[PDB]
Amino acid sequence: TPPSLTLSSPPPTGLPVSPDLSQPHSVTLTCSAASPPARGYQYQWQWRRNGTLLSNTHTRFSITPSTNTQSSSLVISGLRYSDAGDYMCTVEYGVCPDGVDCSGTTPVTGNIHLDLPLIVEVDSSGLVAREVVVLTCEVYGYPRDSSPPMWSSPGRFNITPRYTGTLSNGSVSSSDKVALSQLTIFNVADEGEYTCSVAGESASFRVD
Ligand SMILES: *[C@@H]1O[C@H](CO)[C@@H](O)[C@H](O)[C@H]1NC(C)=O
């Protein structure tokens, strides 16, 4: 007798989510049932990560239903790269009127895929007198490991480490980028692509 229950989001193929990289310390994941509960009914939600039920007793995870229970949001705080990947949201009937049988209704689970990128940028001073170009390798997002930046350029100068500490236990705002390294060119023949590589990611600047 009870109304049907399915998810509008995520769909069967899952939902990708990525954070606001200007405010990277937390992200909100939301799932929604396709229809609101009828009068006298409520939905109940469960969230899982790594096979494991999440609840509000967890420090970095906070779950909140909508007023009508049609949706549920998980806020992950203290975000770091290792939080990336799949999260599962499951909806079921939580309350049903007496004399309605909800026990035949199967819970519905969706998958959210949380993408936590690491972006590299190579910025230039321009040619300046301190004779010289200074390139700075900067990152933002979610550093994966402690791998130092590696500079490259086909063929081929001072490399000064800038920030050398660990960033993989947290995140870096796109409007508070971290400088990892600087390539100084002392002194036409130096024109061309210079690349900074930080683990799997890279960016270039063409010095002309
Ligand atoms: C989930 O599993 C991965 C792989 O073992 C791990 O890096 C991560 O810390 C685990 N915990 C969370 C909350 O993502």
From TrEMBL:
<feature type="domain" description="Ig-like">
    <location>
        <begin position="3"/>
        <end position="109"/>
    </location>
</feature>
<feature type="disulfide bond">
    <location>
        <begin position="96"/>
        <end position="102"/>
    </location>
</feature>
<feature type="compositionally biased region" description="Pro residues">
    <location>
        <begin position="1"/>
        <end position="14"/>
    </location>
</feature>
<protein>
    <submittedName>
        <fullName>Cell recognition molecule, long form</fullName>
    </submittedName>
</protein>
<feature type="disulfide bond">
    <location>
        <begin position="137"/>
        <end position="196"/>
    </location>
</feature>
<feature type="domain" description="Ig-like">
    <location>
        <begin position="117"/>
        <end position="208"/>
    </location>
</feature>
<feature type="disulfide bond">
    <location>
        <begin position="31"/>
        <end position="89"/>
    </location>
</feature>
<feature type="compositionally biased region" description="Polar residues">
    <location>
        <begin position="20"/>
        <end position="33"/>
    </location>
</feature>
<feature type="glycosylation site" description="N-linked (GlcNAc...) asparagine">
    <location>
        <position position="50"/>
    </location>
</feature>
